[PDB]
Write a protein that binds this ligand. Structure first.
Ligand SMILES: OC[C@H]1O[C@@H](O[C@H]2[C@H](O)[C@@H](O)[C@H](O[C@H]3[C@H](O)CNO[C@@H]3CO)O[C@@H]2CO)[C@H](O)[C@@H](O)[C@@H]1O
Ligand SMILES: [Ca+2]
Ligand SMILES: [Cl-]
Length: 510
């Protein structure tokens, strides 16, 4: 049996953990103790707040219908109330104590009806679509005009602020996203926006929508560009006007950060608060992309390693991204580096991502690594996305390991501290205290399909630790179970065994 050493230092690399890394798009079981919630994805592009209609685009035969009301548990009378998909979502946020992120429309049009499929000959402008206008430039109506050809976005923000107060209030909607995957508009939403979005286009639309939002609620955080994946990060999925605008910039990311900075300077307020991406791993194992299906042993191994692509300079995943564009990986430092250069101080969010294996120990383990990684790499907000319907048991386990490990919503600490391991392949470990030094939290996991290892911990810091309790989940139980205590710790050293495919949250006490 293998021995690994883990050195934890409470003095070293102390840094605040944004709680909004514990976030989601769809609510999961309801005991994960999320801190942030997002209403976003393909369906929100064409969502019309006046009648709650929306359009599926390429996901379901370009159907305009009441899917958001029905998926959101709304009765028909509720579906008829302006704003209801969104107010029902935000009401949930308030009950749960979460941050709300609410997507706003920017592709150009929103669903005028719920009659179903919109054919290629009915693409916008057509009786099937209402036109989006950022600034109404007229007195606002809490009950919008349902009979014209327009939906006013600043009017909807005023509706939210009238009902909830401004974002700086306790009950206010705090974040707004600038549509969703705009480099896929022409693919996902051809009936709305059939041409490939341009780089400049995207900037002008972002600036104009940010301005009308901020004129209503100067406290709201505005998130953009909500890029789907690397092809968009690189060149906005071959934008037509790229070669002409690219100049010195190394990728579209720099171009958007910089141009967002410039327009903000000219306006005299920050117009981009958060740099927003989605990240669905292209990582492969046994012929299978990890996001598509659970897969074989090799798929499951590749799922458990993939989170290293986020942070680890030494790691080369099997994917086209790592093959042709390795210079842009690991991806969080790379995005950080662009932010630092082109728009200092902009926050970073991963607003829709998933590692697959939703009901496999490999997905629970992947996620438990990822949550530790996001926390200590200056990510402000992150929001899981369900690629599979029904329950996502091991994803849910991962959150609960960090946020409700004992059934009493006890959590990881708010302060990352240095934690190192001698084996980055078979193990990962993430340490935290609270800003109360009494408790040291350690999430540790064994990624091996075969071999336990004994973890030899050495702790440095202000304090001496007497004992601890342990909680975990593994391949046979997705529910977190209390595990064997560490009844005595000699000289800030102790060994605990970590069976294969197991994740533990250890709480050491003084
Ligand atoms: O399958 C039933 C419903 O699908 C709805 O569309 C969803 C797609 O199923 C889903 O793949 C898509 O996920 C995207 C995400 O929106 C943005 N990032 O990438 C993910 C993977 O491509 O999300 C869609 C909902 O937004 C469809 O709208 C319904 O009509 C169907 O009933
Ligand atoms: Ca209208
Ligand atoms: Cl995109």
């Amino acid at each position: 049996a293998k021995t690994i050493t883990i050195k934890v230092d409470t003095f070293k690399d102390r840094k605040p953990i944004s709680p909004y890394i514990y976030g989601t798009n769809q609510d999961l079981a309801g005991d994960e103790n999320m801190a942030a919630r997002r209403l976003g994805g393909n369906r929100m592009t064409g969502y019309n707040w006046e009648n709650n209609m929306s359009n599926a685009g390429s996901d379901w035969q370009h159907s305009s219908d009441n899917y958001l009301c029905s998926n959101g548990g709304l009765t028909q009378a509720e579906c008829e109330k302006p704003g209801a998909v969104v107010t029902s979502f935000h009401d949930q946020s308030l009950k749960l104590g979460t941050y709300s992120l609410v997507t706003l429309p920017m592709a150009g049009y929103v669903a005028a009806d719920g009659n179903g499929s919109v054919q290629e000959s009915e693409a916008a402008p057509s009786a099937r679509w209402n036109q989006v206008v950022n600034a109404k430039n007229a007195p606002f109506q809490l009950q919008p005009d349902l009979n014209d050809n327009y939906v006013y976005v600043d009017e909807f923000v005023h509706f939210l602020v009238n009902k909830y107060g401004t974002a700086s209030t306790k009950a206010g909607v705090k974040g707004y996203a600038l549509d969703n995957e705009p480099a896929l508009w022409s693919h996902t939403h051809p009936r709305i926006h059939p041409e490939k979005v341009g780089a400049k286009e995207l900037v002008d639309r972002s600036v104009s929508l940010s301005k009308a939002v901020k004129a209503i609620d100067a406290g709201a955080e505005v998130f953009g560009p909500v890029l789907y994946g690397f092809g968009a990060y690189k060149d906005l999925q071959t934008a037509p006007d790229w070669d002409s605008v690219k100049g010195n910039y190394s990728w579209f990311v720099d171009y958007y950060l910089d141009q967002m900075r410039l327009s903000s300077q000219v306006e005299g307020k920050r117009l981009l608060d958060v740099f927003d991406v989605h990240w669905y791993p292209e990582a492969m194992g046994g012929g299978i992309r990890i996001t598509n299906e659970v897969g074989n042993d090799e798929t499951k191994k590749a799922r458990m390693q993939a989170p290293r692509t986020l942070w680890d300079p030494t790691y080369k995943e099997d994917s086209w991204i790592a093959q042709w564009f390795s210079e842009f990986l690991p991806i969080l430092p790379r995005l950080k580096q662009s932010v630092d250069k082109y728009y200092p101080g902009t926050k970073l969010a991963m607003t829709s991502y998933s590692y697959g294996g939703e009901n496999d120990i490999s997905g629970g383990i992947a996620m438990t690594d990822v949550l530790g990684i996001l926390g200590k790499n200056d990510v402000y907000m992150a929001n899981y996305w369900k690629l599979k319907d029904g329950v996502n048991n091991y994803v849910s386990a991962a959150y609960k390991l960090y946020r409700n490990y004992d059934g009493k919503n006890s959590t990881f600490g708010d302060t990352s501290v240095s934690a190192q391991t001698s084996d980055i392949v078979n193990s990962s470990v993430h340490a935290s205290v609270t800003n109360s030094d009494k408790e040291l939290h350690l999430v540790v996991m064994n990624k091996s399909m075969d071999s336990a290892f004994d973890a030899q911990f050495d702790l440095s810091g202000a304090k001496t630790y007497i004992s601890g309790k342990v909680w975990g989940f593994d391949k046979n139980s997705s529910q977190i179970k209390e595990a064997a205590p560490i009844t005595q710790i000699s000289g800030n050293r102790f060994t605990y065994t970590v069976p294969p495919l197991t994740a533990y949250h250890i709480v050491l006490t003084t």
